[PDB]
Amino acid sequence: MTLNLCVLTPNRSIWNSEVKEIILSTNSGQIGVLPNHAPTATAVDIGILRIRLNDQWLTLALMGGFARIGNNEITILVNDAERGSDIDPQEAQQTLEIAEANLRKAEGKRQKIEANLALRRARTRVEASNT
């Protein structure tokens, strides 16, 4: 009747209730899934997912990994994922500000890589919080 979704983190299976649509980011930039999709495997970029089942569609920001989608089924391997409602927006925004400030200072070949990937991490947290 529909495709089914299991998103899972290295310690914790987050979303294993099943849905009519999701739409997720990727390194190509954007993709959408609807039921009886052809078998595809996408490396998913860090940044928000949007999932629609029935009435309600909500975004949980998730931190990148892999997403294969088989027959009647999606499974998404992400190293960290949070529901966008469960993060309180303002605190996430504050964290983003801190990350930006540290990035602006942060210097040197590894360190910026860390700063840049941390600010990329922080910026997507509010984008699920607002949405």
């Binding site: 310690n11 990148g64 990994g65 190293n79 590894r110 890589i113 990937l117």
Partner: protein, 270 residues
């Protein structure tokens, strides 16, 4: 005095009750830790199934991923995962003592060690001894999360991609037995493209098969038995379409594996 003797006996009895309570609590915590490892099994079962099929599809000489990229081993990073608190036998002493041999061994090779220390007794060790470099001091944590292994991973991954450090290896105690748990040192980076995980000495297990630790009672006593269930990797779909590039998809995959591994190294140590 008799009263003094009675007081001493009472205190000793109180101590016996307290230590017994602590032992029970520790056992419960260990059981909880076992449950925690089991919860992350679907992610490492699914990941090694993908990481197998991404290698068996690839078969390409022109593909090189940064995490798996091999560079000359001029310098090595060693991350030390020690216990958070005291009163636990020789667990911390043994690890730091075992850590020293690795640092000592590098001097024979002279390839410029660096230590990332995790946990308080490892932190307080390498603070008071400044004749070692430290990359970073990480807080230890009970109930380790993917949040808390990420800050380890964002350090090491970032540090490793730059060529300053090579063959980052981690030492920690695989929970083999209750009565003894010897430290073992593994080679974290550069992740093997076969996904095989192997120790510094030179024994590599296939990543498809790993053994969880389950604690059960043998006879009267409380024991643990590490038993390995191989997770078979189903073949990838014939009609599967790769969204980015096989080299590119694989590049996204490696951090997940590294993150997953660091989390198990720390969970097992805990």
């Amino acid at each position: 005095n008799l009263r003094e003797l009675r007081d001493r006996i009472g205190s000793v009895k109180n101590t016996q009750k307290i230590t017994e309570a602590m032992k029970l609590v520790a056992a419960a915590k260990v059981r909880r830790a076992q449950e925690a490892v089991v919860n992350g099994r679907p992610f490492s079962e699914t990941l090694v199934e993908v990481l197998y099929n991404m290698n068996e599809q690839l078969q390409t000489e022109d593909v090189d991923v940064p995490l798996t990229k091999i560079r000359t081993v001029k310098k090595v990073a060693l991350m030390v995962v020690t216990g958070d608190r005291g009163l636990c036998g020789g667990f911390n002493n043994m690890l730091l003592k075992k850590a020293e041999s690795r640092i000592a061994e590098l001097k024979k090779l002279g390839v410029d060690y660096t230590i990332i220390s995790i946990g308080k007794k490892g932190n307080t060790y390498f603070i008071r001894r400044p004749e070692i470099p430290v990359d970073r001091y990480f807080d230890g944590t009970n109930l380790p999360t993917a949040k808390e292994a990420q800050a380890i991973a964002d350090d090491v991954f970032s540090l490793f991609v730059s060529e300053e450090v090579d063959k980052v290896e981690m030492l920690y105690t695989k929970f083999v037995s209750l009565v003894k748990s010897d430290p073992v040192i593994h080679t974290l980076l550069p992740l093997s493209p076969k996904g095989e995980i192997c120790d510094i000495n030179g024994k590599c297990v296939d990543a498809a098969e790993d053994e969880l630790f389950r604690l059960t009672t043998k006879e009267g006593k409380l024991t643990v038995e590490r038993d390995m269930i191989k997770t078979e990797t189903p073949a990838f779909s014939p009609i599967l379409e790769f969204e980015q590039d096989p080299a590119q998809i694989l590049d996204a995959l490696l951090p997940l594996y590294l993150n997953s591994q660091i989390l198990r190294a720390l969970q097992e140590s805990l």
